[PDB]
Amino acid sequence: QFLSSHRGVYYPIFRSNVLHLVQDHFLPFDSNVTRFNPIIPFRDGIYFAAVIRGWVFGSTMNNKSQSVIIMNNLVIRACNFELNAFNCTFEYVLREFVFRNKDGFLHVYSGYQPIGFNALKPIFKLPLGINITNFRTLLAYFVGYLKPTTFMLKYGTITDAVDCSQNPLAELKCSVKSFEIDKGIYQTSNFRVAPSKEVVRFPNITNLCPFGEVFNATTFPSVYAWERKRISNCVADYSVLYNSTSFSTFKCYGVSATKLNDLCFSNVYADSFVVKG
Amino acid sequence: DDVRQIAPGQTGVIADYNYKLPDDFLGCVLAWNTNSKDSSTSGNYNYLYRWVRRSKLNPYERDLSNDIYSPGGQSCSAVGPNCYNPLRPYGFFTTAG
Amino acid sequence: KLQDVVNQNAQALNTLVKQLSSNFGAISSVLNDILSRLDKVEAEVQIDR
Amino acid sequence: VGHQPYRVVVLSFELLNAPATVCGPKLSTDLIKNQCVNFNFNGLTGTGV
Numbered sequence: 411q412f413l414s415s416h417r418g419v420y421y422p423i424f425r426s427n428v429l430h431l432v433q434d435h436f437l438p439f440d441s442n443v444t445r446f447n448p449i450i451p452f453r454d455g456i457y458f459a460a461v462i463r464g465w466v467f468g469s470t471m472n473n474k475s476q477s478v479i480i481m482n483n484l485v486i487r488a489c490n491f492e493l494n495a496f497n498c499t500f501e502y503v504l505r506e507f508v509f510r511n512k513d514g515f516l517h518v519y520s521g522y523q524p525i526g527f528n529a530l531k532p533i534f535k536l537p538l539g540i541n542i543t544n545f546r547t548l549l550a551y552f553v554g555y556l557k558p559t560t561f562m563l564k565y566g567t568i569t570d571a572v573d574c575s576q577n578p579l580a581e582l583k584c585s586v587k588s589f590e591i592d593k594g595i596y597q598t599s600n601f602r603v604a605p606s607k608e609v610v611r612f613p614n615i616t617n618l619c620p621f622g623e624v625f626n627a628t629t630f631p632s633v634y635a636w637e638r639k640r641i642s643n644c645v646a647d648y649s650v651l652y653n654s655t656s657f658s659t660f661k662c663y664g665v666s667a668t669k670l671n672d673l674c675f676s677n678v679y680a681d682s683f684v685v686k687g
Numbered sequence: 688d689d690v691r692q693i694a695p696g697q698t699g700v701i702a703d704y705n706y707k708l709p710d711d712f713l714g715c716v717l718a719w720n721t722n723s724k725d726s727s728t729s730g731n732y733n734y735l736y737r738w739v740r741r742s743k744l745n746p747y748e749r750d751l752s753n754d755i756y757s758p759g760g761q762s763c764s765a766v767g768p769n770c771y772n773p774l775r776p777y778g779f780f781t782t783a784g
Numbered sequence: 785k786l787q788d789v790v791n792q793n794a795q796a797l798n799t800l801v802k803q804l805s806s807n808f809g810a811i812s813s814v815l816n817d818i819l820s821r822l823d824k825v826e827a828e829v830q831i832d833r
Numbered sequence: 834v835g836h837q838p839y840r841v842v843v844l845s846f847e848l849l850n851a852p853a854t855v856c857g858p859k860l861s862t863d864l865i866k867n868q869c870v871n872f873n874f875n876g877l878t879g880t881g882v
Binding site for chain 1: 834835836837838839840841842843844845846847848849851852853854855856857858859860861862863864865868869870871872873874875876878880
């Protein structure tokens with residue numbers, strides 16, 4: 411609907427007079443912000459602007475998943491609400507706000523002006539540790555979505571930040587790390603476009619590796635007569651094995667275990683045996 | 688055997704389904720046996736862990752929910768074929784290794 | 785002299801571009817395989833190298 | 834616990850420019866061309882067009 415002018419800047423630590431360049435989830439300048447009480451998807455953080463009492467963040471909002479209610483009668487409670495409170499944790503006692511969820515912490519930044527530009531000072535870093543994919547308001551107001559972008563802020567009060575991905579002039583300003591540019595011609599780095607989608611292509615394999623059968627064999631070789639097997643044409647899914655086989659040791663050399671679910675190997679050899687503790 | 692999983696970068700049932708630590712962890716981890724307190728001869732089943740989840744937890748995230756799980760995204764109604772309970776008890780015994 | 789300076793510039797650029805093939809004592813000289821094989825925290829050392 | 838059997842299995846991987854045999858439980862995605870898009874081809878993760 412509308413256009414956000416140069417609004418939606420929040421502090422991403424103390425610093426002063428640094429002209430610091432930071433890549434984070436920011437609201438692009440001159441972006442589309444919707445105007446509105448339905449369920450509003452949260453995505454990667456939101457910039458809310460505006461009688462409004464508070465907010466309700468959550469995933470299902472149906473008592474099957476923890477949701478957090480912020481309200482003013484200031485009360486913040488995270489519990490399994492029906493849309494009454496059981497099995498739950500955190501409890502506490504022109505408008506603009508920015509909501510982000512990083513490392514289980516809900517960052518809430520606030521600001522108010524008598525109506526431009528204004529940096530939103532941090533208010534809360536709540537240790538909630540819940541998955542937020544939807545939210546609602548509790549009672550005309552504008553909602554915008556943050557995207558990953560690189561900004562160049564001035565600074566310990568932020569002043570006149572610039573977005574590097576909107577104009578050639580802004581790109582030049584960001585690549586020179588200065589807000590005042592003299593007459594001339596300068597080369598610039600690519601701040602214009604960054605990838606958004608992903609293109610995963612894996613081979614046409616559907617069989618599952620027989621880890622369960624191998625690890626459940628009734629007999630194993632002596633260490634001096636260790637065998638070898640070639641594993642091929644199967645999908646290495648260790649998750650199916652979490653139901654058993656506690657795996658008192660899972661040291662991985664070269665590759666990282668977390669990556670083993672997104673790697674393809676040309677040849678896998680399994681050598682099995684029995685030893686002392 | 689699951690204490691090894693409480694560290695940044697590890698993967699396993701605890702690391703990715705129950706408790707996840709940030710890659711930029713700044714702190715400490717303490718662990719001590721309580722076989723004389725948290726275990727019993729008949730078995731102390733009051734301790735549970737989540738062994739199924741569609742996606743891995745983000746760092747420092749909690750997953751309090753007991754909805755019946757189905758690998759195929761079906762409408763499960765009770766524990767049975769293709770309807771698993773995501774929570775499983777540890778079953779701590781005094782004499783176990 | 786003129787051909788010499790032209791050749792010098794060409795050889796300097798060629799050496800600079802060919803310097804990427806060296807892994808500089810890290811796991812590999814390519815960022816893609818380092819990032820697809822080693823997790824972030826461990827990959828920091830290779831990226832720094 | 835020291836004098837108790839401990840079944841050990843050692844997995845050795847080869848990441849060569851050869852057809853893949855063992856792959857992770859990821860789902861392939863459609864092909865997007867002429868766009869600066871992240872891609873993951875059989876473990877080769879990169880950014881390109």
